[PDB]
Structure formats: structure tokens, C-alpha cells
A paper describes a structure:
The CsiD protein belongs to the non-haem Fe(II)-dependent oxygenase family (protein family PF08943), but the native substrate(s) of the predicted enzyme and its role during stationary phase of E. coli remained unknown. We purified CsiD and demonstrated by NMR and LC-MS that it indeed hydroxylates GA to 2-hydroxyglutarate, while the co-substrate αKG is converted to succinate (SA) (and CO2), as is common for this enzyme class. The biological tetrameric form of CsiD is generated by the symmetry of the crystallographic lattice, as it was previously the case in structures lacking the by then unknown substrate. The enzyme protomer adopts a distorted jelly-roll fold composed of a β-sheet core flanked by α-helices, as previously described.
The crystal form obtained (with symmetry P4212) contains two molecular copies of CsiD in its asymmetric unit. These two non-crystallographic copies are identical (RMSD = 0.082 Å). The iron ion is bound to the active site of CsiD by residues His160, Asp162, and His292 and three solvent molecules that complete an octahedral coordination sphere. In ligand-bound structures, one or more solvent molecules become replaced by interacting oxygen atoms from the ligands.
Author numbering:
A (entry chain A), B (entry chain A), C (entry chain A), D (entry chain A): 16 to 141, 154 to 216, 224 to 325
Write the structure that this text describes.
């Protein structure tokens, strides 16, 4: 469908993943209107992250924020691949960070990243599969969304993003109905305790799982987790999504798992990534008390 | 007016800011009587900060302490620019620290400074505006006063201190009456939570704001804070105050905001500053219990 | 006796210490079936420690896990010396870690080791007695088992493992019946407080003692502990057990103490050790509440 | 008077300070009987500190421990200068540490020293007065005794130990009767709060004061503390005690203050000191509950 300032079309891999592309005029107007705040200003004054968010939504006639929220909160969808025409070179890295910052802070706020000391983190890669998982399993607070942007890609074969929607996972019911699905388990980076499965407000399964940080306490927990891991990694429902330079995935971390495919080692290989993670925060008509 | 040991006259920028100058005999007597305690002694034994305070007040016939307190606690004023005749060269830095220490510890106590590990901190600058703000917004305890002294100034164009009294701010009522003025917000350097506005004992607005450390939790808080920031930075009520070498501002941090103007970059530029921050502490006739 | 996949025979030093040796086919099948997970995978994903445990037990027709548990929990025994035919060279260090990991995680889970940052630790030695003690005396949680493997041994004379079963200690009753046996004492690596003696579920003495970390608070506690130390170190019941390359002791840390004999200094000496420590965790028919 | 294994005589400076000297046979027997434990063994196994204490007391026919306790707990005395004939050279430093350790752990236990990471600390000096004070004012637990030993002394003029017994302080009543004597004040190295004065079990004044770590909160506390400091430092009751190599003071830290006199700077100057601090711990006939 055609919106004001951007277009929206389903991905080739799945109708659950929608591709959102900002038009060229929108992209140029946005970058002009945020030129006076470099990324270092966004790092130092967090309210500027919401200022650039409002500027982008205003340029889309205030159609962007409700669309982002409706897509990410919809159980049938919950995932976007987002880009802006004209921003597609490593040479535009700062502008990429601004764009992703503006989109993310229309639907919530990105959390402190311990690897960078900032609200976002950039990594340079210079080859085995990274297993499907959820982010933020080792703290008490829930991470609602994961944002992963491709900043550079050079002599790279493979390395697609892997995604798994729980309602595409053919083994969901077998593991969700197991008593250990509800057993609170230790997660360690202070340790936290929570089950591997939970439910959304409608009672549908959600997941908070990663094989590296879950700490089975005994032979019962450990064997079940090793079978769970195999059942996830071999699922027929996994998507393999290329993320070209300038595009970023933005997914609901509660019923999407994500990972990374193998890639070929190459002497002239360079991949650069940017990530942000946060919680949803939005207005809705709902009950309160007092005045 | 003419006091014992010093003179007092309103500043050129505002009747709220009073200039206090210690006479030459007072300055020389004070420095003689505190010569046996170097600044390093003041750093190691905090009671010596109150000893030098008493010596200065005694030399002013005990007229200094009540005058400082009356000025700083008066809502109509609350700010002083202070100097002593004959102390005006970088070469006298230690004597400047002694003088500011004595004045500050007549009205309270200066807190530990994490940048220096001492009760005061000195910084050397070797050019964009520093936005108006209050100090101490990221801890639970209230910072009542801010002290900023000019220790050296060399090939410096611009860089005046900026000040804003809340009762000179033409947008005060518009933002103080907004519901978000009372919303406790996160501040981070353990995080603390407090609103951007509060009230003094008479119900008049006070502020605890800085754009770098406030952490809006969502799009509502963030957009409002970005508008608040603009309304402060563009206020017609801002003062631009030069602070020559040997002078220091001492302001009530609850209804004065402070910042720093732009200055010209220059290869031979050198500016040195000293700061202290603390809480008020003073005698008054008021109620207590027991015996 | 002859089991499926391994043999079991009493040690030459004591009927309480049983020697368990995995046959050559079992050893080769196990190493083949765990080849796809290097030790670094076991370090990163703790459930793989239980996966390799199940593979080893399955190869022993599920006779290994009940035998290990019965031996370690039996007050009359409680100690094993374990090896696998064909694994006996420093050159096979990784395979040794896999084997010990699989055995340990059939009976419990190995705890984080602060010296290595992993669930196991390897040390290289390149000569006085190490006194008998229990592990884990300076934390609140109980360490149920100690695992010590010989990874390398080169020009080494002496250095046998020393072991003492409390029911072989001729002075047990004299010290267990002393009032200070029940006095909670300070242990320091946050400090913890617990007595030097306790009881098992049947009221038989157990010990949580080490001379380096216990901190007697006064002359009464200190003199008694110095006599206790002498009564332990001179006991006639101490075993001197050689541990050849590829063998590991696995002992119940509650009623076995362990140490190390003196060895000869030698310029070409090299000894490498691996340790793990953990708690028991196993299924049994016992009571619970609710559903 | 003549005891078994040592002699006791009042000092030249004060009848409150008793000089205790171990005879030559006692010193030689003690060092022989503790030869198998080097100081590093005392550092690692704290019960050995009580073992060497018992050996020394046994060599004195068990007359040492009751004498030490009676002297240190007696309000009229409370201070000892202790040495052993034949130990008086830097070359005997280890033996000095053993001797002081044995004496201290007959009357209590020495606490962890943050400057050395051990139960004792050695310092090398290579010249202004160190003001009179009590140790341990910045933690909650009470330090009952201070031990300071002279390990080396080379080209040293001055630098006597200074001591002040509260009942020799001519200004005690003037300050003890001031309301601020009972005001809990902040002490900082987590901060602790306690008054500068307290009382012993008989209601007689004791002190917990040091000028460097007390943190007066305002002009009232600070001026009083500066006058208190002057009243202490100028007291006629201060003792000036030389401490030759091999001697150590052992004083009751509750009603003795201690410091150090000025000394002459000299290019070939070397002074080495050892300190321990701890709490009293001893048997007495007193009430308890239960069985
Ligand atoms: Fe991730
Ligand atoms: Fe400031
Ligand atoms: Fe051990
Ligand atoms: Fe001291």
C-alpha cells in the first residue's frame, strides 16, 4: 500500500515480515532537518532521540508512528525490514544511525548498550551459524524489540539474518506443553530467574531463550534444553533474510527469535553492524486511577 | 552600601546579582592569618575549611556571614559575584581557593567532587554554548549552591557565564503548569527519580534540570523536554556575565540556572576554572523537640 | 564387578575408594559421538555439559549414572578414581576435560571457577605438603563433590593425592564432641559463618574445614583450631593415592578431606591439573506438595 | 617487679606506661619454638598467630597473658612498651613480627590492614608532627588496641611517639561537657556516624577522634572541631616516647591518643615501622544465658 512518505510491501520470505522504504524526498527532508544534531549529540542528550523521531513522523504526515506500532504489536506480523532510498553506503553511517534512532524512538526507547557505553553499538566483522535466540534474557526487564542494521558489507557470501516466528515453529506445542516450559531457570551474563516460555496477554506462547546464558541446574533441565535447542535450530519455519547495506530489521523480541547464517571466510571481508534494543512505549486508551 | 571589610553593589547585568568586593586591607589580613594552612591542609582536614571561614568573617566584624546568607536565600536575589582586591593573577591560584573556601563554608559545606577527588576541582580549557542547567540532578541530595571561579584567562574572546533566574524566564508558567512538570523522571550520571520542577517553601517554582542527564522514558517525555530545552535556551531573561580572573559566582542552584557562552578558538588560548558545589547550613530561630 | 561399558574394582589403598575404568570401545564411541562439540562449546553453552553426560551414560546402557550416585552418596565409600583406556597423554587434554565433564554432570553440576572464569580450571605446576581440607568453605552454598584430574606428569617424584575419610580418622570423636565443633566461625576468601563440623541426615559428622580460610576470633578458637589441624595432619587414616595421567578423583566433599603430598623439586618438572567443584543433583522418590 | 620470663618497670615519661622486657633465655626459647612457622605462614593461617601466642605465654609460666590484660584494661595505665633482649636489628625483622604477633594475640586479634593486605603492615620512611588521634574511627567496629613497632632507625633525629592519656588532658572536662561532644558526626575513609566522645562502662570519657577523617557538616561542628584540635595538640599532658629498634608500643586506643613528633630531614635517613590494630578478646567470669 501507498502511505505518506513511505511505501510498505510484504517480504519475499514471509508475509509476516513487511518491508518499509522511505521515499527519496522524505529521506532528504529528514536528513536536512536533523543536520544540526550530530550522532554525538544524540548520544549525550537522550531527548534528541525523540526529537528526531517526531521530525521523521511529521514528514510522514503522522502516519509512520501508528503504522510501526500496529505492525510490531500484531501477533501475525511483528517484524519490519526498513530502509530509506539514497542511504546505502558505509560513507553514510551517521545518517543510518539517525534514521534507525528516529524509527525506534517512535515506538519506545533504546536501552544502554554495555559493549559501547551508548544507546547503540556498532561492530566490525573481519563464520558458523549464530543460533536463534531472544535478546535481554539475563536481566529482569523485558526487551520488547531488537534492531539490527547493516552498515557495511564487503566481499560477504552468506551471513543472512535468520528469523523464527513462534507460530511458524512446528515444534512449539510439544515444548510449550512440557512442564519444564514453566520452570524458572537461572540466566547469567546478578543472575535472574525466569522460565524459557511465557504467555502474552491472550495466553499465546512467547519465549525468552538463549543457549549461551541459560544455566540448567541439573541433568533434567540440561537434557531438555539440549533437545529444545535442536528442535529450534532444525525448524522448517526459519527465514533466511538478506539485509543489504542501509537496511535494518526491527522485530518483536517476544515471539520472534533471530540469529545469523554461516558465511564464507575471505581475506578482504568486512561487515559492519549496528544494534539497538529497547522496550515499547506508546499511548493507548486504557484505564487508570485517581486524577 | 558600605560594610565592614567589603563593599556591595548591584551588577550591570541585573539587580538580582550583587557584586561583593573585599577591600585591600581585609584581603591582606585574611591571607596573612591563613598562611600556615596550605590548600593541601584544607583538602586533608575539612574542619580547616570552617576555620578559614571564621577568620574571614571575623575580619569583616561578623557582617559577612549574615549578608551572604540573606542574599543567597532571598528569592529576589540569590546570586553573588565575589572578588578581593589584589588577587587577580593565575600566580595567586592557591589564595583564590582559600578565599572561595572561606566564603562557601560560612553558608554551608562543599561536597566531594568526583572529577578531582577533593572538595573542589580545577579545570584547564585549551567553544559552543554550554546549555543552562542546575547542578546535582543525578543524586538524591539537593545541591543548594554552585561556585565557579575564574583562575586564569588568556587570549579568551567570549565565554561569559550565562545565568537565568526562573522569575526572569518568560515561559516559566507555561511549562510549570504542564502535567509533566510534576512527573518524576529518571536522571542518570545509581539512577535517581525526581521531577524537573518542584516548589520552594512558599510554593514558587524551582528547577532540577539538565539536558545531558535527564532520561525521558518515552515519546511523550522526550518531545516535551526538547521543547522545554528550546524555551530555556532562547529566553530573553538570560544574563551574560563576564567573570574576570579572581572573581567567582556563587548562586542559589534552586532558582538560578547557569551555563557558558560560546568563545573563539585560538592557538594561545588558556582558561582555568575552579568549582565547588554544596548544601546550605546555617542557624535560625526555628522549632525543635525534646531537650 | 563387570558392568556395561566399564569395570569397577577397589583401590589398593582403601576399600572406600573404587577405581572405575571405561573400556576401550566405550571410550572411543564416546569421543566420536562428542567430537562436534569442542571444549570451548562446553564452556559457552552449559547444557552441552549435560548432553555429553547423557551420551556417556547411554553408551554404558544407563548403568553409569546410578552407579556413580550410589557410590558417592554411600557413607562407607564416597570416592572414585576414574579413567578411560586410551586417554593417558597431555596431548589428549581436551578429551580428558570432556570425559570428566560428562561424568560430573551425571551426578550434579560444576560451579563457576574464579581462577579460570569457566566451569573448570587447569593449572600448571613447575613442594611441601598441602594440608587436608574441604573445598568451598568460604561461601554459603555447600560444595558436594571435588574433581581433580591429572593432565600431565613429567619428572615428578611424590605429589600423591592425600585423602582422609572422617570414619578413618582416629581423633574424630574427641574433636566432634568438643563444644567448639558446633561454634559458628568466620570464613574469609563477603565472609560467611558456619561451624567446622556438622552432621549428615543420619547425624554422623561431616566437616567444612580449611586452615587458610578459617578465621578464629580469639585465643580460645585459635588454639583449638591449631590442635585440630595437628590431629588431622598426623592421622593414621590418611591415604596416599597416585593419580596417573588421565585419571581423576571424584570424592564426596562432606566426609572426605583431601590434600597433596610433598614432591621433589626438579628443573625439568611439569605437572598439570584440572579441577571442578559442584553440588549433587539427582532424581529420587521423595515427597513434594501441590501439583 | 620480677615475673617469670620477663621484667616490668615504669617508663621515664609516665607511670601509666609500663616497659615490659623479655629476658634473653625467654627470647631465645620462643624464637626456637616458632622457627618452623615463617611469617608467611602466620599470614596465611591465622590460627598460627594464636599458636605462637600460646608458646610465648607458656614460656612465661602463663603469667604474661593475665598481666597484659590487666595492664591494658586498667584505666590508670593502658599502655606498654615491649621488647625482647637480643632482638634489636633490622636484620631481625621477621622475628620482631613474630614477637609482636604473639603478644597481640594473647589479648585479642589483629584486623586486616588495607595498606598491606595482611594482618600487619610494614612501612619505610625516607617530618612535621603527626597529630594525636585514635585509630579505626571510620568503621563501625571498635578498635581496642594499637601496636606500633620500630623495625629500623637510621640517621633519625626526633620522631618520638607522642601519647596522650585522656586523664592527663587538662581540657578534657571543657570539651566532654560540650553538647557537641555527644553529637554523632560523619567519618569518612561507606561513611559511619558516631560522636567524638563516648563513655566507658563506668561513665568515664573515651574518644574516637582524628582530624583527617571527621567531616563536620557545618560551621558549628567545624569551628568546635578546630578548637578541639588545638586544645589536644597544645596539651601539657602529651608524652614524648622514644621507640628504639625492636621495641613496640601497645596501647588502649579508647583512652590513649597517639601521634608522632617532627624529625629532621636527612639524605641518609631510614625509618621502618610495623603496625597492627585489633579488638580485645579474653575470658572473664560473667553472665550468659541458656546452656
Ligand atoms: Fe541477538
Ligand atoms: Fe554546572
Ligand atoms: Fe582443594
Ligand atoms: Fe594511628
Amino acid at each position: 500500500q501507498d502511505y505518506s512518505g513511505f511505501t510498505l510491501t510484504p517480504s519475499a520470505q514471509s508475509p509476516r515480515l513487511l518491508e518499509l522504504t522511505f521515499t527519496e524526498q522524505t529521506t532528504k527532508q529528514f536528513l536536512e532537518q536533523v543536520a544540526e544534531w550530530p550522532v554525538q549529540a544524540l548520544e549525550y542528550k537522550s531527548f534528541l532521540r525523540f526529537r528526531v523521531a517526531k521530525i521523521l513522523d511529521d514528514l510522514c504526515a503522522n502516519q509512520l508512528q501508528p503504522l510501526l506500532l500496529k505492525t510490531l504489536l500484531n501477533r501475525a506480523e511483528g517484524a519490519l525490514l526498513i530502509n530509506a532510498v539514497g542511504v546505502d553506503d558505509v560513507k553514510q553511517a551517521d545518517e543510518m544511525v539517525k534514521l534507525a534512532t528516529a524509527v525506534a524512538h517512535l515506538i519506545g526507547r533504546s536501552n544502554f548498550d554495555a559493549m559501547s557505553g551508548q544507546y547503540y553499538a556498532r561492530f566490525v566483522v573481519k563464520h558458523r551459524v549464530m543460533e536463534l535466540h531472544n535478546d535481554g534474557t539475563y536481566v529482569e526487564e523485558i526487551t520488547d524489540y531488537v534492531l539490527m542494521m547493516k552498515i557495511d558489507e564487503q566481499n560477504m557470501q552468506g551471513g543472512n539474518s535468520l528469523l523464527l516466528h513462534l507460530d511458524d515453529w512446528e515444534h512449539l506445542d510439544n515444548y510449550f506443553r512440557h512442564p519444564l516450559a514453566r520452570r524458572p531457570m537461572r540466566f547469567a551474563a546478578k543472575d535472574v530467574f525466569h522460565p524459557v516460555f511465557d504467555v502474552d496477554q491472550q495466553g499465546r506462547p512467547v519465549m525468552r531463550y538463549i543457549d549461551q546464558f541459560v544455566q540448567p541446574k541439573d541433568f533434567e533441565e540440561g537434557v531438555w534444553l539440549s533437545e529444545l535447542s535442536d528442535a529450534i535450530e532444525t525448524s522448517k519455519g526459519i527465514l533466511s533474510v538478506p539485509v543489504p547495506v542501509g537496511k535494518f530489521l526491527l522485530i518483536n523480541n517476544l515471539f520472534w527469535l533471530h540469529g545469523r547464517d554461516r558465511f564464507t571466510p575471505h581475506p578482504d571481508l568486512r561487515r559492519e553492524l549496528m544494534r539497538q534494543r529497547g522496550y515499547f512505549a506508546y499511548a493507548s486508551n486504557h484505564y487508570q486511577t485517581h486524577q
